[PDB]
Design a protein around this ligand. Structure first.
Ligand SMILES: [Cu+2]
Ligand SMILES: [Cu+2]
Ligand SMILES: [Cu+2]
Ligand SMILES: [Cu+]
Ligand SMILES: [Cu+]
Ligand SMILES: [Cu+]
Lengths: 336, 337, 336
């Protein structure tokens, strides 16, 4: 399209919502291509990531880790206003794995504290895609400080299986998985710092071990449990978008399955079916579609069980509805 | 199906066999859906995991690491009697990745020492699937103590390739791969412990490094070598089911290939073909189908070669038959320049 | 083919070229099956792998890390003369993952210093495949000393997409990724050794941590950056073959995509499409096809960004041509 053609397109302003929720959107595109407008303010803030009070200096798109899911349709333009307030200390930018050119946008969006920028790109490819900050010379440091999120570029006709049959979800959740590298003192106690820059050198030493101290969903151990457990009902179709900007993960819904899994995150690549545990490489997002068949509590995990149950990569679903004894029954309950 | 309908179904009692062998079964289903019955006693037992005598307090389904392969067909019910004998000290359960609800069965199978339970589930999806113990609060500790196996749910019509052609194996092996995290003393020597619980804290520390001290097939370094090497012949079609309940692996048949590989383990997901090295993420099983074309020794490995040859993740095949010089030949044998 | 038929096949000597470049070949096979002849001399030599003068006793097929890409077509034979000069101190061999029998050729090619050997195998399967040295009892040590490369076995009719439409590249690069495990003294300084064998015990200790000290392309930090960046033009179609003989990787073209990715490296397995980040497991090669749409500098990385930007796994592309504002534009440049 020409500059004139783009200028003539409808605009839509989106209000983003905090993960794991996703802003209001339509699965099938409503009308022709639009310029979809988003605004995010970057917040450098302390976050507490475990029950021992361990802190990370987060660098947070829209004030959350992960940043919010942005949803557009194929061949819409995503137009992001990105704001780096004067209250921040570092330069930041944004790279969309969905975008083409200038390192995914990072080359055009370098903003100091007190600056803003507006980037527009054409969402040419359908799928879920990581976005993350990547300042030249301090790339992994920003990413492992939680400066990453994802977008979803839906096909204009919504989702389909490998044979073109429509797949319509009732709910969608966005699980951003974060590897953190928290320095420890001589006694193995996690260190605290009073400025993000103060933590740099110590954090880089831990990073280079390639061994995260914490692996978490939505920025903290137990974040997506209890008050924040995801919910569904028997019969409900749920899409789970999962990203990891820096490190491999192996999602698994304990008690359920990934009925359709776009493991690569890309909708023009046919999904795998009947998945027990799928695999998302570091630097990518994937998506699983599941129809709940049993009520009860499910654990959604990274299925390295040390990472899930020692390092923090475990979320819950609470699912309402009627038990199905055909699928599963206790023929003899635990007994002498 | 109603309770009455399930009750009307035929029952078949299966006798399990120790890995890497698999109990007698039919590739194509014989008759309609059945309730296939299995029994396993859990054994907390000391095992030796290398030639040095390094010990693990294993938590073993049916007394083996891995637990045995249970084979059913799609829409059969798998009915497991699970027994935790009074001689054990821990509560245990079982989670079938194949199953739907109650955390895969875990929520319904928590048995203390001296207890049993019987779980039935409908095997709705065809493929190979991990099973493992997962007691709330102690999940990875049971799994990395060897308390895991796999099941195969064959399609009722047996295996096919991605394009409708029947695939029939002559033999099947189940390779369970296990990451062990054995504590070391100040000299770097592996520690031995009196009771399993004595090892807990030291073991969790190693686990947290995400660096196994041993990565093994069938419970020990070299377990599938020597007189325990797997066997085949030129022209023989072999299915190798491979599981890893906790940690990624990248299986490779050195000297061969994976002709058809269901890397995700799921038979409705078309297999990759002509594979050198395939990838099974932790918490999953995969399966590779290969027709041997050359005689001799093969090494079947996790192709992180450090994991294979330093940490223990290598098995052997001994293959009989005639050498094929078309496929490969030594034009000039090692000789002076 | 019968004995006489095999004997009657044309023999063709091919001159090799150092990575990331690839020797002369045709995408579509020229004529019927051939015995393609290659020669490689093994060089044991000290190489510097970083900006701090860190040394590795490299074990290098053809003097390079990775060894060079050999290109044949399906049902050709690859006939390699492998030479181990008497100036070397170790026995070596070669295993082709493409080959069938004798551990991939290793059983037939065990050459001491002052020995040569000639191995022929039929390239029965189309794809990119790892080759590496693997002396019994010293397999990972040779491999992580850089003694590995890849071959490409093109389909006789060249590459195709999932729909059988031809994919014809304008150029091809071969990126070999190497995990190194360099010992350090107790002050954290990388150690140096007089002979390769002197480093053996110390190196195996680092190897067993499963944590490389360096993860590099073309044998060294920054080998494929700056004046040695790979090149392309807007509209150019590029195939990027990527191998990792020992350890997982997750390639990503920063600013671009993998339009078609044979992530498993096997051409009979349909390519994934529209990929952000693909995954090649340790012990395999993969290949990505991309058509450049934007000019400028791209970074091509292993998207564990710690491995990329701390440990060395980052290359560049320098791409010429006209910027496409439809795909991406700075609506508002960074500003107060
Ligand atoms: Cu990126
Ligand atoms: Cu599990
Ligand atoms: Cu190999
Ligand atoms: Cu940033
Ligand atoms: Cu257990
Ligand atoms: Cu070698």
């Amino acid at each position: 399209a020409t500059a004139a053609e783009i200028a003539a397109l409808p605009r839509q302003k989106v209000e983003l919502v905090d993960p794991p929720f996703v802003h209001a959107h339509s699965q099938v595109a409503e009308g022709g291509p639009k310029v979809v407008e988003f605004t995010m303010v970057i917040e450098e803030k302390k976050i507490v990531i475990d029950d021992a009070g361990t802190e990370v200096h987060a660098m947070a798109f829209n004030g959350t880790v992960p940043g919010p899911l942005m949803v557009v349709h194929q061949d819409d333009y995503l137009e992001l206003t990105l704001i780096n307030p004067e209250t921040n200390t570092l330069m930041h930018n944004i790279d969309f794995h969905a975008a083409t050119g200038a390192l995914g946008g990072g080359g055009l969006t370098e903003i100091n504290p007190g600056e803003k920028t507006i980037l527009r790109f054409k969402a040419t490819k359908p799928g879920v895609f990581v976005y993350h900050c990547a300042p030249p010379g301090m790339v992994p440091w920003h990413v492992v400080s939680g400066m990453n999120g994802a977008i979803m570029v839906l096909p204009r006709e919504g989702l389909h299986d490998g044979k073109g049959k429509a797949l319509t979800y009732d709910k969608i959740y966005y699980v951003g998985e974060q590897d953190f590298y928290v320095p420890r003192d001589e006694n193995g106690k996690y260190k605290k710092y009073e400025a993000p820059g103060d933590a740099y050198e110590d954090t880089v030493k831990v990073m280079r071990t390639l061994t995260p101290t914490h692996v978490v969903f939505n920025g903290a151990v137990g974040a997506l449990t209890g008050d924040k457990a995801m919910t569904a009902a028997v019969g409900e179709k749920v899409l789970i978008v999962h990203s990891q900007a820096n490190r491999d993960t192996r999602p698994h819904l304990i008690g359920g399955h990934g009925d359709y899994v776009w493991a690569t995150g890309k909708f023009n690549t046919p999904p795998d079916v009947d998945q027990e545990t799928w695999f998302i490489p570091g630097g990518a997002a994937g998506a699983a579609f599941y129809t709940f068949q049993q009520p009860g509590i499910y654990a959604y995990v990274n299925h390295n069980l040390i990472e899930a149950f020692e390092l923090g990569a475990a979320a819950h679903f609470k699912v309402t509805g009627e038990w199905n004894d055909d699928l599963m029954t206790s023929v003899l309950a635990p007994s002498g």
